Each structure stands twice: as structure tokens, then as C-alpha cells.
Scaffold this active site. Structure first.
Site, mmCIF file in Angstrom:
data_model
loop_
_atom_site.group_PDB
_atom_site.id
_atom_site.type_symbol
_atom_site.label_atom_id
_atom_site.label_comp_id
_atom_site.label_asym_id
_atom_site.label_seq_id
_atom_site.Cartn_x
_atom_site.Cartn_y
_atom_site.Cartn_z
ATOM 1 N N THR A 1 -8.742 -6.750 5.382
ATOM 2 C CA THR A 1 -8.327 -7.793 4.444
ATOM 3 C C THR A 1 -7.947 -9.105 5.126
ATOM 4 O OG1 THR A 1 -5.989 -7.099 4.534
ATOM 5 C CG2 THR A 1 -7.417 -6.042 2.862
ATOM 6 N N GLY B 1 4.393 -3.069 6.247
ATOM 7 C CA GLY B 1 3.988 -1.681 6.396
ATOM 8 C C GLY B 1 3.988 -1.277 7.872
ATOM 9 N N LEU C 1 5.707 23.770 6.769
ATOM 10 C CA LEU C 1 5.249 22.457 7.186
ATOM 11 C C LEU C 1 5.540 22.180 8.670
ATOM 12 C CD1 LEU C 1 3.900 19.892 6.297
ATOM 13 C CD2 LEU C 1 6.072 19.084 5.448
ATOM 14 N N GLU D 1 5.934 24.597 10.893
ATOM 15 C CA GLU D 1 5.216 25.644 11.618
ATOM 16 C C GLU D 1 3.869 25.054 11.944
ATOM 17 O OE1 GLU D 1 4.913 29.211 9.358
ATOM 18 O OE2 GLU D 1 3.521 30.193 10.659
ATOM 19 N N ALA E 1 0.805 -1.197 0.000
ATOM 20 C CA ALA E 1 0.000 0.000 0.000
ATOM 21 C C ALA E 1 0.843 1.255 0.000
ATOM 22 C CB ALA E 1 -0.893 0.022 1.196
ATOM 23 N N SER F 1 1.310 1.568 6.907
ATOM 24 C CA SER F 1 0.073 1.059 7.492
ATOM 25 C C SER F 1 0.030 1.151 9.017
ATOM 26 C CB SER F 1 -0.122 -0.379 7.078
ATOM 27 O OG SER F 1 -1.203 -0.929 7.742
ATOM 28 N N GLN G 1 1.895 1.697 -3.488
ATOM 29 C CA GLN G 1 0.844 2.111 -4.410
ATOM 30 C C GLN G 1 0.445 3.571 -4.175
ATOM 31 O OE1 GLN G 1 -0.635 0.135 -7.029
ATOM 32 N NE2 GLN G 1 1.175 -1.147 -6.613
HETATM 33 N N1 LIG Z 1 -5.586 3.102 0.703
HETATM 34 C C1 LIG Z 1 -5.059 1.961 0.202
HETATM 35 N N2 LIG Z 1 -4.959 0.902 1.034
HETATM 36 C C2 LIG Z 1 -4.437 -0.267 0.615
HETATM 37 C C3 LIG Z 1 -3.976 -0.389 -0.765
HETATM 38 N N3 LIG Z 1 -3.517 -1.643 -0.884
HETATM 39 C C4 LIG Z 1 -3.672 -2.266 0.316
HETATM 40 N N4 LIG Z 1 -4.254 -1.442 1.192
HETATM 41 C C5 LIG Z 1 -4.558 -1.662 2.618
HETATM 42 O O1 LIG Z 1 -3.375 -2.113 3.288
HETATM 43 C C6 LIG Z 1 -3.699 -3.130 4.240
HETATM 44 C C7 LIG Z 1 -3.039 -4.431 3.826
HETATM 45 O O2 LIG Z 1 -1.632 -4.215 3.888
HETATM 46 P P1 LIG Z 1 -0.617 -4.292 2.651
HETATM 47 O O3 LIG Z 1 0.094 -2.973 2.453
HETATM 48 O O4 LIG Z 1 -1.276 -4.903 1.439
HETATM 49 O O5 LIG Z 1 0.383 -5.415 3.205
HETATM 50 P P2 LIG Z 1 1.981 -5.317 3.139
HETATM 51 O O6 LIG Z 1 2.483 -4.016 3.724
HETATM 52 O O7 LIG Z 1 2.399 -5.547 1.703
HETATM 53 O O8 LIG Z 1 2.429 -6.451 4.175
HETATM 54 P P3 LIG Z 1 2.591 -7.982 3.756
HETATM 55 O O9 LIG Z 1 1.978 -8.200 2.393
HETATM 56 O O10 LIG Z 1 1.919 -8.691 4.897
HETATM 57 O O11 LIG Z 1 4.084 -8.185 3.721
HETATM 58 C C8 LIG Z 1 -5.208 -3.225 4.214
HETATM 59 O O12 LIG Z 1 -5.732 -2.357 5.225
HETATM 60 C C9 LIG Z 1 -5.578 -2.760 2.821
HETATM 61 O O13 LIG Z 1 -6.909 -2.249 2.738
HETATM 62 C C10 LIG Z 1 -4.112 0.814 -1.621
HETATM 63 O O14 LIG Z 1 -3.750 0.805 -2.808
HETATM 64 N N5 LIG Z 1 -4.641 1.916 -1.080
#
Ligand SMILES: Nc1nc2c(ncn2[C@@H]2O[C@H](COP(=O)(O)OP(=O)(O)OP(=O)(O)O)[C@@H](O)[C@H]2O)c(=O)[nH]1
Ligand SMILES: Nc1nc2c(ncn2[C@@H]2O[C@H](COP(=O)(O)CP(=O)(O)OP(=O)(O)O)[C@@H](O)[C@H]2O)c(=O)[nH]1
Ligand SMILES: Nc1ncnc2c1ncn2[C@@H]1O[C@H](COP(=O)(O)OP(=O)(O)NP(=O)(O)O)[C@@H](O)[C@H]1O
Ligand SMILES: [Mg+2]
Ligand SMILES: [Mg+2]
Ligand SMILES: [Mg+2]
EC number: 3.6.5.-
Lengths: 426, 428, 331
Positions: free
Chosen positions: B170, B137, B243, B245, B12, B131, B15
Site C-alpha cells: 500500500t 501495527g 496451544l 504444547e 488491519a 503487521s 479489522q
Molecule cells: N489482511 C488484511 N490486511 C490489511 C487490512 N487492512 C490493511 N491491511 C494491510 O495492512 C498494511 C497497512 O497497514 P495498516 O494496518 O492499514 O496501517 P496502520 O496499522 O493503521 O498504521 P497507520 O495507518 O500508518 O497508523 C498493508 O499491508 C495492508 O495490505 C485487512 O483488512 N486485512
């Protein structure tokens, strides 16, 4: 990266495995000659997970064939893609368990397996980033079960840090096979539980019904049952073949599918699963996939979910689906069917998404999961077994191979413990 | 002269990262190959005649995440050293992500970050996309926060953190990863944003008329906020709020550093021809619970601190009226301990949307960032999910087996209780 | 017919040289009649946290004191014919291996007192036979291994449990026992590591079966006694063998997790106790709420450097005081 080694435990594994490879080869653009002639780089990016790369841009199925039936060997050599498969992997002895697991594990199997393992080692040493093994076998059969069980134990000792993914044919309530099917199954299950990380149970009656009724293949031959099984195996391997919106892996499934080590048994199904005429009466949208995926009667098991509780479900999708579309359907299902899911987990559905569909479908999905309904398998084995065993039926087949009755006592007890855990979660 | 280095960690993070870079590229007109036909160095360092390169590192254990990046349209833009992975995923298990296998690329990430830092003259700090519970993440985030604290310390540690939603999720071990992720985060971050996947889909379908939104839509709304908050590092305004501030003024207490946010206006192309997009209406929209990027309801808390970042065709006089308008909204409860009104920044640069996007371009926009007691709601829900899973020790064996002491979960829980307490006491 | 509570002792270790050299609260935790009280400073607030045990031993109390009290009472009950289990808990670095050997510790003092009394019983004799046999097993890399054999093929099966191909030795004298213990120790899987010096790479199991013909009505009692150096709670990074010592640490922590879940299940009176899952807990089958009387030996540090570890330990152990059993005389 994250390579898999496959083992085809006798004819069970060979018929299922052969279809697996025909399907997978088509998925990766692999010609009957072994050369790649596909459409996309994605077909090559992960091809080494399942195939050995070779001159001629060839991709050879990474599998070992194991049995005591030379007739099977020749039959396999004569089949599709046989010219590709590496000749060194035809590991066939010349005898047969005779439906005697002890003979197939303690004696004939014991000699065969060291040859097989020397091959397994050479195959694993040819890998750069081996993730695990995938082996297909039966429980109540002879050589297949014996060697399956035996290889799983020995491979686990040699590769304790690898994934052990087991697919197997298990005893049915009516469509039985060997005269000692329950003995062989009892013995096999006991040994398999302590070595396997993930396993999928296959009920032939379900495969027969799906073909007969769902696909309207009212002549549900073995070739058709293989479609359903190989489709499932292919489904499971999607994560190691093609990318998407929610990337995934087998280790993620293990971490999020098995809350307690013994709850590693799966009762899979998939969607869309339709007949031909029915193509004019469908709508390949996520709600359709969802209804089929959560249809208790669409699983390849006698262990009908309506009599148990889901412990954990994995919904793996393939194709360019909307994530809001998918999320709402998964939520709607849990809300509507909450009475069928375990109260121990505040989310019983895991989601993974590959953006690449299987050949021929706009959308598809694979549904796997662990449920307390699984205890029906173990109860059937136990009832069929305990009834025969208490009469010492065929007991000479096992004691003649040096088996103590204690082995059966322990195995029966093990199944009672598997049942007890399913019950604790219900 | 202000510079920023970003980290995009986990699928994520990557992306979102890619989306953020597409937008940053768009905003300055850089071509996919790094050519263009200055303030641009804040994000894209000049590297040589004819080329600038984005200051970022993409981090994961999944080889797939980067392999996808390597085939993207900006593969000619980023130097290959900027894309780093290990060999195996975290299996969504903090134990693997942080202690056992996260270790595989710590040095590589440090190498790239240190090289980028050595190339900067005015590094304001780092911006990380990660995350609040999800494998690598959480895992690398923990590893990298320790290292950034040690190697830089004083440089800004600003992050966007993806929040598991009340319903959208997920996996099932997410609350274990979250309670541990948060515990670690609380000891290293200077400021972070909560980003709710469910709320963002709701915005996409209600405000942008997207019938069935996906990740590629959610990422656009996120990039609009990222841009507006960091726009002031590079673009001139009437009120040139820095930023740092901004962060300094937003955080009255060391433990209250996780603001909630929104963005307005959010419109479809059709709405572009009907909405009365004045400065005041946009400002007013920012305070409606319905438009927030997190599923919290501000009517159940108090506003401790808030900053309104105005962009584009905005006159300070319009703004003064807009702020005065907000000051009459008795329905908005502000913390009893803060007589201070709104902090306001006004950037001359108008917002932009991305071609092939969804959000229509407007003459005026506002990014609203705030600290509120109401966020406790978000944290409480994660703890409720956690208590059930933990009490049953469901899947705990995976954490323990992969390298964790069971007791760590109680350490984190105690700190989460403190986290809730921190928001309550400042509210009280 | 009523069940009774299991008993527990908590001991504080003297400060390590490292702990004395480091600046920390030398005595974060203190002991009263049976209360263990710890001061903690967290989130800028200070709290007093505390638990109560049945027995306690501060850093100022030695093994001789314990011998005349803790060992004394346990051994008499073993000799009465109660089936008994001595087990323990703590984090790695707590000291329990040290106290098992007294480098004179529990295996030697407990066994010596038992055999000294049995020898006094032989003097009282002067069909009163002493049919005594022992075994040493260990669980290493999750494989039960026979420390009394030559140059892991141990089947765990129903008696209660019995182990297929386990070597067992008879006893004529303490001197023989001593030699046997010493030999078992030499064969024991242990290690020096970054922080600890007597790493237990295995769960070390010592079993004594006392089939004593304490006849009048010919009565034989079997004073079964099980002493186990359950491995403690570890952090691989904290010590910092690629993949072996980490594997052991994880297997150990999983073992403890499982034991914990079993204890919790026993406390909550579940309809099924998952002791049947792990081989460790299967080996502990009758200790886990059965006819075996059990005792918990827990060890903590007095230093603030281990507050989290200490509280985790004390909470585990304190909660475990809710375990009850129906101890019986093996007649
Ligand atoms: N906003 C957003 N959330 C995402 C996206 N892809 C995955 N998620 C969220 O990220 C979480 C899942 O974590 P990921 O980032 O896919 O997992 P990872 O960091 O690759 O960790 P592992 O695959 O376990 O090594 C969930 O809450 C998903 O909804 C995206 O493109 N945008
Ligand atoms: N779903 C499928 N089930 C099959 C297929 N072929 C056989 N079977 C089922 O498996 C059982 C028969 O097993 P096998 O021929 O595999 C026994 P195996 O050759 O492994 O060992 P032997 O005892 O040495 O023959 C039985 O339940 C059959 O009905 C198939 O192609 N598909
Ligand atoms: N009460 C004590 N007095 C003096 N030294 C002690 C004491 N307790 C432990 N030690 C010392 O600390 C080192 C021992 O660690 P022990 O061997 O005590 O660790 P442990 O808990 O068994 N670690 P582990 O085996 O990895 O689970 C030994 O060399 C002991 O001499
Ligand atoms: Mg056959
Ligand atoms: Mg990932
Ligand atoms: Mg030790």
C-alpha cells in the site's frame, strides 16, 4: 480531530476556495443557510475538520479571506453561502500590490498580514486538534502572491508543527497574466520552498484543455476551470472527511510521497472525468479509472509525464471497489509503464481507499504525484524571468520597494536547484 | 479453565480482530448484545446475569479505526474501556509509531490489559493481530511487546503478523518499517504466524471462486486458522493438544518461531457438492504449495516441524492412514535433523463458516502449521526491497526527523541477516 | 590538479563515572598505530571489527600530546595560507564539546597557537599588516544566529558565502580574542540534560579570517579557518523539554543525515551534490570537495555500552576517508 484552517489568497484563492466550499458543503449535507440536512452521521463525524459548529446545527466554513481589494470583499459577501461564512474573516485591505510582489510582500502586504495573522491566531485557538493549514494563491499575481507567500512564511514560524498544504496557480507557456509574472513567480517560489510541506501546481492551460476537450466544454470559462480545481482539492481532503477499506491521511502522503524535502510539488488529476454525451460510452470500473488516472494528458499540468519520470504516485479511490481489482490494476500499470517510473523505489504507487463515493459517481479516484516532468514548470519560469531580468525590465518596480537584485539571484538559483533535483531523479 | 486475551492493533489488526470476534461469537451463539439463549470464558468472560464480554483490546492512533468499531454491531458487546486510541496516525513511520507518538496510549493499553489479566484464573496468554511493517501495527506492537515481556513474561506471546507481499503493498516505506518491526519482534515473541495478503487473495479466487476478493474475504480465511489453532483451548478432542504444547513441539530452536500455515479444505458452495472431502485428501491438500497462506514455495526448503490439527468428523484411524500417506510423499523434504514425524491434534468440534461468508461448511477440516527453511524466501524479499530504499536513503529523512538514528537501520539489517542465517543453519 | 584525501583523527574518551560504576567491557575497543579495533558479541557470536584512521588518540593520550602533533600540523597549514575546515562527528555523549574547550581545548589551543605564531610573525616584522577578523555563529532551532550581536536575521548568500548583517570583530590581541570567545560562549545556546552536561543546542560555528600581508610582489594571504561543533547524533527517549529538546535532537539528526548524504554523494562522484539543500551544507560548500583542506575529529567511548554507537561512528568516519579535495593557498 485533525482540523484544517483554510486561506483564500485574494481573488485566486477566493474563486477557487468558494467553489471548494460549495462542493464540500454539498458533500457534508450543508444547506445554503448553514444548517445540516444531510443523509448520514458520517457527514457530521468529520465536519469539524472543515467547518465551525454552531447553534442551529450550523457548519461555518473554516476559512480566512485575504486581499487588498475591497471590491473582492463585497463580491465574496454577495456570493453563495455568504450568509454562513463568519463576517470576522473578511480580511481585506484597501490598496493592491499592482502586480508588484515586493509591494505585495515587503510593503502593503507587510501591513495587511499582521491583521490577517491576528485573525489566523484567533481561528487556530478555536481549534481542538489542528493538523494544518491549506492556502490557495497564484505565483505571478500581485496581492494574491504577495500575501500568499507572506502568510505562508509567517504562519510557518507560528505553527512549525502543523501541515502546510499549498495550492497554486503557476506560469503557463502561452496563457500569461501580469507583465512581471516571472518576477513575481521567481520571488514567490524562493520564499515558498522553505516553508511549504506539500503543494499542488495549477496550469490554467491544462484546465482550459480538459474543459475544452475532455469535458467538451468548448467554451472553457473560469467557472468550469473551478470545477476541475475544486474537484482536486476535494479529492485531496477525502481522507479527512470519509472512511474506507484503506484509511489515510496527509501525513501518510508526506511520508510516502516526498523522498527528499524539495520534491513536494504535485501535478494532480482525477477520474472519471467525462462529458455528458460520453456517459453512454463508459464503464465505471477500476480499469477505467486507472486508464484515466495514468493518462499523461489527463493531468492539470503542462508537465506531461511522458517527458519525465514518476517519482511517487498516490492513487486514492472512492467507492466500494475490490481490493484485488485495484491492486492488480496498479501492478499492471507499473509493469506496463515501468520505463516512466523512477528506479529508486521498488513500488512507485501508493494506494488509499475511501468506501464512500463523491456525489454523482459510482466510482471515483484522485491521482496525485511528484514527477521529474515538473522541471518544465521551473524551466519556464526561469527562462521567462532571466530574459526579462537581464534587461532590467521593470526592475524599478522592485528596487523602488527596497529589493536588492540579490533576492532575484538567490531565487533564480533556487529554481535551478529544484530543477537539478528533478534531473538527478531522471 | 484456559483463558486468552487478545490485542487488535492498527487498522488491519482491528479489522481482523473484528472478524475473529464475529467468528468467536458465532461459534458459541452469543448475540450482538452479549446475551445468549463453561469453556466460553476462554474468550468471553461472564460479566453478570445475562451477559458475557470478549476479552480484548483494540489499539491505534487513528481515531477513525475505533470510531468505526464504536458504530459496529458489537458496540453493545464490548465494554467501552476496550477501545483505545491516540490522536494522530503514525504516517506509516516506525519512528512515530514506536518512539514519538506511540507513547500517547501506552498506559491506557496497559490499564485495560492489566485489568483483564487480573480477572483471569488460567490465562494461557495473549493473542495479538498486527503487521510486519505498517505504522501503529509496528509501533504499538513494539511498545506493547516490551511491556508484555516485563509485566507477564511467562504468559504466551502468540501473534499473527501481516506480511507485505512480493507485489501487494500500500505504501513505499513499508520495508523500513518491516526491517525495524522484525528486529524488535525477534527479541520478544514466543511464536508468530506469517500472513501474506497476496497469497490470501489467490486462495480466495482459486479455491473459493471469488472473482475479485477484498479485505473482507481475506479476513475470513485468517479467522478460520485463528479458530482452529485456538479451538483446542476451549473444545474437546480425541487428541487434546494444548496451544503451548503445540508451540513447544513446533519450535526446536529459539530463533525459529515463525511458522507458515494453510487450511483445508477451502471450497465454494458448488465445490461442496463435488469434492471428495476425506480425511486423507484434506491432509494431502495441506501440503500443496498452491494452498499456502504465504507466497513461499516449500520445495525450496525443508520441513523442520509440523502439526496437523484435525477437526470434526475425523477418526484417529483415518488420521493414522492420512499421516502414513504423507510419510510416503518423497517430494516433501524434512529437515535432516528431525526424524520425528508429524505432531497431530484432533478436535471433536467441526469447523464453521460464517453466514454471509464464502467458504462452505464441511464435515472435516485440517489446519496445518509448520516451520520450514523455505520461509527464508519471504524474509529475503523484504531485505531486497529494503536495500534499495535504504541505499538511496529514500524517505530516510522522515524517519530521522520523526525520532530515529539512521544507524538503527543497519542494526536491524544485521539482525535480519542473522534471521536468514538461523533458517539456513537449521536447514543445514 | 589532483584531489587529495581529507584527514581524520579518532579519539577515545576515558570512561565516565557511570561507565566505571556499571559492569561492562571497560575496553571493548582498542587503538594500535592507527587501527581502531572493537570486539562485539552478537547473536551468540563474537567478531573483531575494525577501521583505520590517519591519526588516533587513545584514552591515555591528552591534549598536550595532540597539541604538539595534531594541532601543530594543522596550524602550520593554516598559516601557510591554506583555507582549512575543522569539523567533527560522533554520537551525543562522545566528548567532542569537552575537547573544544578543554574543560584547554581546540578553540583555545588552536587559536592561541595561530595568534602566538602571528605574534611571532609581528616580531619577525620588527606593508606587513595583520588584517584579522573573526565571527561566531550558531545554528539554533535551524536558525543561524549571531553570537557577536546584541538584543537570527542572517541572510546566507553568495560571497563562497557571506552573511547579511553578521557582526564581525577585528583582532588586535589574544586577550581580546579570549574575551570575545568567552562572551560568545556565554551567549551560546547550550544545556544540561538527563545524561549529558554540555548539550549543544546549536551547530556552533567559529570562523577566523587571517588577511595577512605576507608581502615580499605584494602578497596577501587569507588563512581562512572554520571550526565547527557540529551537533552529534542523538535519542530523545534515551534521555527522556516536551517538544524543544526533541525538536533540536531531530533537527540535528536530520542535519547529520544530510551531511552524510552529501559525503556519500561526494564519495560516489554524483553529477550533483545536494549540499545545496541544507543551510549547514551550504555553509560547508567549499569544504565539500572544494579548495578548503579539511580534517575530521571523531570521538568514541572505550566501553561496550556504546558498541553500536561506536561502530556507527567509525563506519561513517572511515567511509568519509574516501572524500577528496583540492586544497589551495589563498593568495
Ligand atoms: N489482511 C488484511 N490486511 C490489511 C487490512 N487492512 C490493511 N491491511 C494491510 O495492512 C498494511 C497497512 O497497514 P495498516 O494496518 O492499514 O496501517 P496502520 O496499522 O493503521 O498504521 P497507520 O495507518 O500508518 O497508523 C498493508 O499491508 C495492508 O495490505 C485487512 O483488512 N486485512
Ligand atoms: N482556474 C482558474 N483560473 C483563474 C480564475 N480566475 C483567474 N484565474 C487565473 O489566475 C490569473 C489571474 O489571477 P488573479 O485575478 O487571481 C490575481 P489576484 O486577484 O490574486 O491579485 P491582484 O494582482 O491583486 O489582482 C490568471 O492566470 C487567470 O487566468 C478561475 O476562476 N479559475
Ligand atoms: N575526555 C573527557 N574526560 C573527562 N570528562 C569528559 C571527557 N569528555 C567528555 N567529558 C565529560 O562529559 C560531559 C560532557 O559531555 P560533552 O559535553 O562531552 O557531551 P557532548 O558530546 O558535547 N553532548 P552533546 O553536547 O549533547 O552533543 C562533560 O561535562 C565532560 O566533562
Ligand atoms: Mg484581484
Ligand atoms: Mg491506520
Ligand atoms: Mg555539546
Amino acid at each position: 480531530m485533525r482540523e484544517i484552517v483554510h486561506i483564500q489568497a485574494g481573488q485566486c484563492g477566493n474563486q477557487i476556495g468558494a467553489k471548494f466550499w460549495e462542493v464540500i458543503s454539498d458533500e457534508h449535507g450543508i444547506d445554503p443557510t448553514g444548517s445540516y440536512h444531510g443523509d448520514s452521521d458520517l457527514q457530521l463525524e468529520r465536519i469539524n475538520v472543515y467547518y465551525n459548529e454552531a447553534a442551529g446545527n450550523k457548519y461555518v466554513p473554516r476559512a480566512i479571506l485575504v486581499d487588498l481589494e475591497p471590491g473582492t470583499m463585497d463580491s465574496v459577501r454577495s456570493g453563495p453561502f455568504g450568509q454562513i461564512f463568519r463576517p470576522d474573516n473578511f480580511v481585506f485591505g484597501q490598496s493592491g500590490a499592482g502586480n508588484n510582489w515586493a509591494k505585495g510582500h515587503y510593503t502593503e502586504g507587510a501591513e495587511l498580514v499582521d491583521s490577517v495573522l491576528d485573525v489566523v491566531r484567533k481561528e487556530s485557538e478555536s481549534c481542538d486538534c489542528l493538523q494544518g493549514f491549506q492556502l490557495t494563491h497564484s505565483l505571478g499575481g500581485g496581492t494574491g502572491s504577495g500575501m500568499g507567500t507572506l502568510l505562508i512564511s509567517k504562519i510557518r514560524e507560528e505553527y512549525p508543527d502543523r501541515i502546510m498544504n499549498t495550492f497554486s496557480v503557476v506560469p503557463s507557456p502561452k496563457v500569461s497574466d501580469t507583465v512581471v509574472e516571472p518576477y513575481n513567480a521567481t520571488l514567490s517560489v524562493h520564499q515558498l520552498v522553505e516553508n511549504t510541506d506539500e503543494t499542488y501546481c495549477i496550469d490554467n492551460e491544462a484546465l482550459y484543455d480538459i474543459c475544452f476537450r475532455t469535458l467538451k466544454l468548448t467554451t472553457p470559462t473560469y467557472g468550469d476551470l473551478n470545477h476541475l480545481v475544486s474537484a482536486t482539492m476535494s479529492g485531496v481532503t477525502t481522507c479527512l472527511r470519509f472512511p474506507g477499506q484503506l484509511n489515510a491521511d496527509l501525513r501518510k502522503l508526506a511520508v510516502n510521497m516526498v523522498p527528499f524535502p524539495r520534491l513536494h510539488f504535485f501535478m494532480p488529476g482525477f477520474a472519471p472525468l467525462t462529458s455528458r454525451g460520453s456517459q453512454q460510452y463508459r464503464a465505471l470500473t477500476v480499469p477505467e479509472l486507472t486508464q484515466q488516472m495514468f493518462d499523461a494528458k489527463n493531468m492539470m499540468a503542462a508537465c506531461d509525464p511522458r517527458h519525465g519520470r514518476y517519482l511517487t504516485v498516490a492513487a486514492v479511490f472512492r467507492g466500494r471497489m475490490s481490493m484485488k481489482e485495484v491492486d492488480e490494476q496498479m501492478l499492471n500499470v507499473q509493469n506496463k509503464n515501468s520505463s516512466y517510473f523512477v528506479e529508486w523505489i521498488p513500488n512507485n504507487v501508493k494506494t488509499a481507499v475511501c468506501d464512500i463515493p463523491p456525489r454523482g459517481l459510482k466510482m471515483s479516484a484522485t491521482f496525485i504525484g511528484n514527477s521529474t516532468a515538473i522541471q518544465e514548470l521551473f524551466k519556464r519560469i526561469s527562462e521567462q524571468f532571466t530574459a526579462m531580468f537581464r534587461r532590467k525590465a521593470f526592475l524599478h518596480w522592485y528596487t523602488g520597494e527596497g529589493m536588492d537584485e540579490m533576492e532575484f539571484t538567490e531565487a533564480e538559483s533556487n529554481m535551478n536547484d529544484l530543477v537539478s533535483e528533478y534531473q538527478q531523479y531522471q | 479453565m484456559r483463558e486468552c486475551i487478545s490485542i487488535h492493533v492498527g487498522q488491519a489488526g482491528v479489522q481482523i480482530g473484528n472478524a475473529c470476534w464475529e467468528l468467536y461469537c458465532l461459534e458459541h451463539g452469543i448475540q450482538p448484545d452479549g446475551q445468549m439463549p463453561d469453556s466460553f470464558n476462554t474468550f468471553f468472560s461472564e460479566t453478570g446475569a445475562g451477559k458475557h464480554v470478549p476479552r480484548a483490546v483494540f489499539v491505534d492512533l487513528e481515531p477513525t479505526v475505533i470510531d468505526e468499531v464504536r458504530t459496529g454491531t458489537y458496540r453493545q458487546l464490548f465494554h467501552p474501556e476496550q477501545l483505545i486510541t491516540g490522536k494522530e496516525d503514525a504516517a506509516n513511520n516506525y519512528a512515530r509509531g514506536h518512539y514519538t507518538i506511540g507513547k500517547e496510549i501506552i498506559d491506557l493499553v496497559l490499564d485495560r490489559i492489566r485489568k483483564l489479566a487480573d480477572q483471569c484464573t488460567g490465562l494461557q496468554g495473549f493473542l495479538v493481530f498486527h503487521s510486519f511493517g505498517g505504522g501503529t501495527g509496528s509501533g504499538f506492537t513494539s511498545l506493547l511487546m516490551e511491556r508484555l515481556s516485563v509485566d507477564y513474561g511467562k504468559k504466551s506471546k502468540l501473534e499473527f503478523s501481516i506480511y507485505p507481499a512480493p507485489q501487494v503493498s500500500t505504501a513505499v516505506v513499508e520495508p523500513y518499517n518491516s526491517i525495524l518491526t522484525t528486529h524488535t519482534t525477534l527479541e520478544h515473541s514466543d511464536c508468530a504466524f506469517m500472513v501474506d495478503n497476496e497469497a490470501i487473495y489467490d486462495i480466495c479466487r482459486r479455491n473459493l471462486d471469488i472473482e475479485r476478493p477484498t479485505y473482507t474475504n481475506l479476513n475470513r480465511l485468517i479467522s478460520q486458522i485463528v479458530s482452529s489453532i485456538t479451538a483446542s483451548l476451549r473444545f474437546d478432542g480425541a487428541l487434546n493438544v494444548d496451544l503451548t504444547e503445540f508451540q513447544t513441539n513446533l519450535v526446536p530452536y529459539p530463533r525459529i518461531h515463525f511458522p507458515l500455515a494453510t487450511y483445508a479444505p477451502v471450497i465454494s458452495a458448488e465445490k461442496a457438492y463435488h469434492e471428495q472431502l476425506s480425511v486423507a485428501e484434506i491432509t494431502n491438500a495441506c501440503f500443496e504449495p498452491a494452498n499456502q497462506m504465504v507466497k513461499c514455495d516449500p520445495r525450496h526448503g525443508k520441513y523442520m516441524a509440523c502439526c496437523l490439527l484435525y477437526r470434526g468428523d475425523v477418526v484417529p484411524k483415518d488420521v493414522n492412514a492420512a499421516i502414513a500417506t504423507i510419510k510416503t510423499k518423497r517430494s516433501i523434504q524434512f529437515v535432516d535433523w528431525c526424524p520425528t514425524g508429524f505432531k497431530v491434534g484432533i478436535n471433536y468440534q467441526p469447523p464453521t463458516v460464517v453466514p454471509g461468508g464464502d467458504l462452505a461448511k464441511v464435515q472435516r477440516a485440517v489446519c496445518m502449521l509448520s516451520n520450514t527453511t523455505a520461509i527464508a524466501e519471504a524474509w529475503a524479499r523484504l531485505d531486497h526491497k529494503f536495500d534499495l530504499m535504504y541505499a538511496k536513503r529514500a524517505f530516510v529523512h522522515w524517519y530521522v526527523g520523526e525520532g530515529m538514528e539512521e544507524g538503527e537501520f543497519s542494526e536491524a539489517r544485521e539482525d535480519m541477516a542473522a534471521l536468514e542465517k538461523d533458517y539456513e543453519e537449521v536447514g543445514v | 590538479s589532483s584531489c587529495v584525501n581529507i584527514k581524520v583523527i579518532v579519539r577515545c574518551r576515558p570512561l565516565n563515572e557511570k561507565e566505571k560504576n556499571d559492569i561492562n567491557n571497560e575496553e571493548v575497543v582498542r587503538i594500535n598505530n592507527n587501527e581502531v579495533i572493537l570486539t562485539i558479541n552478537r547473536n551468540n557470536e563474537i567478531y573483531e571489527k575494525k577501521y583505520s584512521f590517519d591519526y588516533a588518540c587513545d584514552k591515555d593520550v591528552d591534549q598536550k600530546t595532540l597539541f604538539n602533533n595534531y594541532i601543530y600540523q594543522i596550524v602550520d597549514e593554516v598559516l601557510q595560507g591554506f583555507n582549512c575546515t575543522l569539523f567533527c562527528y560522533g554520537q551525543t555523549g562522545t566528548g567532542k564539546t569537552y575537547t573544544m574547550e578543554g574543560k584547554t581545548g581546540l578553540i583555545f589551543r588552536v587559536t592561541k597557537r595561530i595568534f602566538d605564531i602571528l605574534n611571532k610573525r609581528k616580531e619577525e616584522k620588527i606593508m606587513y599588516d595583520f588584517n584579522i577578523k573573526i565571527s561566531y555563529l550558531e545554528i539554533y532551532n535551524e536558525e543561524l544566529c549571531d553570537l557577536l550581536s546584541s538584543t537570527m536575521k542572517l541572510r546566507i548568500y553568495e560571497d563562497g558565502l557571506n552573511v547579511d548583517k553578521l557582526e564581525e570583530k577585528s583582532i588586535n590581541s589574544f586577550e581580546e580574542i579570549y574575551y570575545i570567545i568567552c562572551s560568545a560562549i556565554k551567549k551560546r545556546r547550550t544545556a544540561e540534560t538527563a545524561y549529558n552536561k554540555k548539550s549543544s543546542r546549536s551547530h556552533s560555528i567559529f570562523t577566523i579570517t587571517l588577511i595577512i600581508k605576507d608581502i615580499n610582489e605584494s602578497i596577501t594571504k587569507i588563512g581562512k579557518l572554520n571550526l565547527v561543533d557540529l551537533a552529534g547524533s542523538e535519542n530523545a527517549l534515551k534521555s527522556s523539554s516536551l517538544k524543544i529538546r526533541q525538536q533540536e535532537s531531530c533537527n540535528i539528526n536530520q542535519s547529520l543525515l544530510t551531511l552524510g548524504r552529501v559525503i556519500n554523494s561526494l564519495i560516489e562522484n554524483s553529477s550533483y551534490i545536494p549540499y545545496r539543500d541544507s543551510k549547514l551544507t551550504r555553509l560547508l560548500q567549499d569544504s565539500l570537495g572544494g579548495k578548503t583542506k579539511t580534517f575530521i575529529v571523531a570521538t568514541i567511548s572505550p566501553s561496550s555500552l556504546c558498541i553500536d554507537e561506536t561502530l556507527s561512528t567509525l563506519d561513517y568516519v572511515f567511509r568519509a576517508k574516501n572524500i577528496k579535495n583540492r586544497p589551495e593557498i589563498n593568495i
